Amino acid sequence: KWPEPVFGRLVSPGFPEKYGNHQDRSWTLTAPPGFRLRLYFTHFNLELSYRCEYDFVKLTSGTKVLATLCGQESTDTERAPGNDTFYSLGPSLKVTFHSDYSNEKPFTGFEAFYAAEDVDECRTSDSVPCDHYCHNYLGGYYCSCRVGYILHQNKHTCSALCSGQVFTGRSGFLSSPEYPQPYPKLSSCAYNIRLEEGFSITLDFVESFDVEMHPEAQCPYDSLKIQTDKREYGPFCGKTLPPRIETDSNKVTITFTTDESGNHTGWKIHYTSTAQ
Amino acid sequence: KWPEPVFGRLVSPGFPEKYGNHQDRSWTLTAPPGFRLRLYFTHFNLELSYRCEYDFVKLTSGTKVLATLCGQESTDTERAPGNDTFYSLGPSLKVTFHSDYSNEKPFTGFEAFYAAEDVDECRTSDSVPCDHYCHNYLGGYYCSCRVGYILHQNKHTCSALCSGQVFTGRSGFLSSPEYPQPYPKLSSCAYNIRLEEGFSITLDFVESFDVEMHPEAQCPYDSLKIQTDKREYGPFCGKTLPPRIETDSNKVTITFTTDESGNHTGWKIHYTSTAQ
Ligand SMILES: *[C@@H]1O[C@H](CO)[C@@H](O)[C@H](O)[C@H]1NC(C)=O
Ligand SMILES: *[C@@H]1O[C@H](CO)[C@@H](O)[C@H](O)[C@H]1NC(C)=O
Ligand SMILES: [Ca+2]
Ligand SMILES: [Ca+2]
Ligand SMILES: [Ca+2]
Ligand SMILES: [Ca+2]
Ligand SMILES: [Ca+2]
Ligand SMILES: [Ca+2]
């Protein structure tokens, strides 16, 4: 029915007595997904050989050779456990004991203990899986984002809430989120300047303009586009303030989309109005 | 069927918007046995009052008042969470939000996250539960002992393997385990000096003698007794070398028992032989 927590004890054959010659032991330990295995030795004493060729206790996790332990104390070519802690790479860990044909001294083998352990994905690896807040739990983790933001479909990146602010004043200011700091990733901002009939809106790119532009592809990454009831403008990208735009419309919509990477600082617009 | 891992998110009513007046919220979070709850705030902003009387977020674990959180920053009489981490005392934790009748400023409440977590009984508390080796695992722990020792019935203390060494030489030395260091707890040592018919064994308490003795009860704690086929000797306890014992036997048995506490260094005996 319900599965017991994974933990146990591994020893050399006949422990605490001496271990024999021509012996082989192997254990394949497996934790649930989201869990890894913690292993350590309370006792260790084997035959010393170059690269631990003769007798050895090897720890592997799939293809990765985690350890090859021999002797009593570590050398420049051989390693002894001591009270060090060994962790599996993933939920799996294989432990193998081997002895050759002879043992000059009565080497007394090993005693080691293991237990399943929750992987803390929030502290593992400077390569944070979460854009804003990381939340760890037994056998998993998830991301959240701060105020004015929402968790993206990818369950990691945090998109800004920068859509649906309607401007109705004769003049005002628009800007990418966090301006003049780098605008957030995978965000879709929608600005709507709606004025009464008889007015014309004018847009002025002020201060700074830094939307991600890469060579001979124009703006396939981040895109700043302008739409009126008469025409379209954009996509505007680059590092130079775009020229003044005198729309002959009382309603103007500005859309700003971003990709998955970049530290570009964005844009800022001052809009004004004139009468007929 | 199978129970999901315990984790979740708790917020003030209407979060991220302002929280209202005359509101009350309560959550009783419970982890499995051997697990505790980890709680932290990503957001916190409440009304400040003396000892957080008006509005508050209180954290309790049974009877223990873990926290009473108010305001924005901590004072000398009030506390704000910040990015501090709060742990439950046991598998249970109650979280209570309360607001009074009025809020002068638009206080915007809180956002907090929680998750179940394995209690590490081996690192918790200088009051180690295990005598020798402590081994932690998900939802529990157990003890083991080093070589020459075995785990006692109490699953914690480690008794010495000091029984059944037969002496057959004309002379030799006996001693409490780890002598001249403090003898182990809850141990039962049995020494057997067996010689051929025609010999008489003599016992000499040498060097030092320190068996736990407490006033006017003689030796009810640790007991060193001697048995021959003619009589008995002991129990010997105290801080003075006991007098020489000339047994008229070729077989002598010495039994040494210990209790659950003490740093007494024990005893050492030199036995010899004479002919008829
Ligand atoms: C661990 O530490 C103890 C105490 O320092 C030492 O006696 C022992 O050799 C070390 N290594 C192992 C494998 O126990
Ligand atoms: C946590 O730390 C951040 C960054 O220093 C800070 O802005 C915030 O006020 C702190 N407290 C909470 C509850 O987030
Ligand atoms: Ca060998
Ligand atoms: Ca996890
Ligand atoms: Ca970008
Ligand atoms: Ca209030
Ligand atoms: Ca535990
Ligand atoms: Ca004692």
Author numbering:
A (entry chain A), B (entry chain A): 2 to 126, 129 to 279
Reproduce, without paraphrasing, sentences from the article in which this PDB structure was first reported.
The lectin pathway of complement is activated by complexes comprising a recognition component (mannose-binding lectin, serum ficolins, collectin-LK or collectin-K1) and a serine protease (MASP-1 or MASP-2). MASP-1 activates MASP-2, and MASP-2 cleaves C4 and C4b-bound C2. MASPs are homodimers that circulate as zymogens bound to the collagenous domains of MBL. Each MASP comprises two N-terminal CUB (C1r/C1s, Uegf, and bone morphogenetic protein-1) domains separated by an epidermal growth factor (EGF)-like domain followed by two short complement regulator (SCR) domains and a C-terminal serine protease (SP) domain.
In particular, MASP-2 CUB1-EGF-CUB2 (subsequently called MASP-2 3D) was crystallized in the presence of citrate that chelates Ca2+, and although Ca2+ was bound to the EGF-like domain, the CUB1 and CUB2 domains lacked Ca2+ and became partially disordered as a result (Feinberg et al., 2003). Because there was no structure of rat MASP-1 3D, and the existing structure of rat MASP-2 3D lacked two of the three Ca2+, including those Ca2+ that form part of the binding site for MBL, both rat MASP-1 3D and MASP-2 3D were crystallized in the presence of 2 mM calcium and diffraction data were collected. This resulted in one MASP-1 structure at 3.7 Å resolution and three independent MASP-2 structures at 2.6–2.7 Å resolution. For MASP-2 3D, 279 of 280 residues were visible. Interestingly, the three structures overlaid closely, with RMSDs of 0.682, 0.871, and 0.992 Å over 276 Cα atoms. The only notable differences were in the N-terminal seven residues and in a loop within the EGF-like domain (Thr125–Ser130), probably reflecting flexibility. A major difference, however, was that the structures now contained three bound Ca2+ compared with the single Ca2+ in the EGF-like domain of the earlier MASP-2 3D structure. In the MASP-2 CUB1 domain, Ca2+ formed contacts with six oxygen atoms in the side chains of Glu48, Asp56, Asp101, and Asn104 and the main chain oxygen of Ser103 (distances between 2.3 and 2.7 Å). In the MASP-2 CUB2 domain, Ca2+ formed contacts with five oxygen atoms at the side chains of Glu215, Asp225, Asp262, and Ser264. The firm identification in this study of the three Ca2+ sites in rat MASP-2 now resolves a key ambiguity of the earlier rat MASP-2 structure (Feinberg et al., 2003).
